[PDB]
């Protein structure tokens, strides 16, 4: 079964679904935060080493998984109608859906396995969760998983 919880960034902005995209908002908004599901992939040895544990990352209600797809010259973060359990239950590592989770204390960064120069990031209030190649400024790449 997967690990579940909410995700916030260092500005205390929680992931929430707004239409067809994930956005990051303060908990003051009183919107239901997405319940994120995370599960470690059974096949780490086949990928890059020393970059953190490769995980599948999805949401419950609606049951969707995050993946990385090249849209022209840009890797983009997308949601696909997919049950995280189906991916974990697949016999091979499904690379577009995988992210290296690199832990530093209470927070972790999420690096695309398909696009290693890009990381999952949030930015300003109510802005979408995207893939970024730009670190340490306007983009927030350190996230906390709150299992409750
Ligand atoms: C809550 O603490 C945990 C934990 C405790 C109890 C139950 C479940 C998890 C833990 C576990 C062992 C030592 C220290 C801490 C947590 O484990 C964990 N495991 C996986 C596979 C992924 C993620 C994860 C994904 C995405 C993001 C963004 C962040 N931040 C973390 N987290 C962790 O390391 O934070």
Author numbering: 21 to 168
Publication excerpt:
When comparing the apo and ligand bound structures, the C-terminal tail moves in order to open the pocket for ligand binding. Arg121 also provides a π-cation stacking interaction to the central ligand pyrimidine ring. Additionally, the methyl aniline inserts into the back of the ligand pocket in a hydrophobic space which is outlined by residues Val58, Leu130, Leu165 and Ile27. The structure demonstrates why A-552 likely has a higher affinity than A-553 as A-552 presents the carboxylate in an optimal orientation to engage basic residues Arg121 and Lys123 with respect to the flanking phenyl rings. In this binding pose, less active enantiomer A-553 would not be able to make the necessary hydrogen bonds to these residues due to lack of proximity. The terminal biphenyl group does not play any specific role in the ligand binding to IL-36γ; however, it projects into the space where IL-36R would be in the IL-36γ/IL-36R/IL-1RAcP ternary complex. The trajectory of the terminal biphenyl group can sterically occlude the IL-36R linker (connecting the D3 and D1/D2 domains) from binding to IL-36γ ligand.
IL-36 family cytokines, which are members of the larger IL-1R superfamily, include three agonists (IL-36α, IL-36β, and IL-36γ) and an antagonist, IL-36Ra. All three agonists bind to and signal through a heterodimeric receptor composed of IL-36 receptor subunit (IL-36R), which binds selectively to all IL-36 family members and an IL-1RAcP co-receptor subunit, which is shared with several other IL-1R superfamily members including IL-1β. Binding of IL-36 agonists to IL-36R/IL-1RAcP heterodimer induces signaling through MyD88/IRAK complex leading to the activation of NF-κB and MAPKs signaling cascades shared among IL-1R superfamily members.
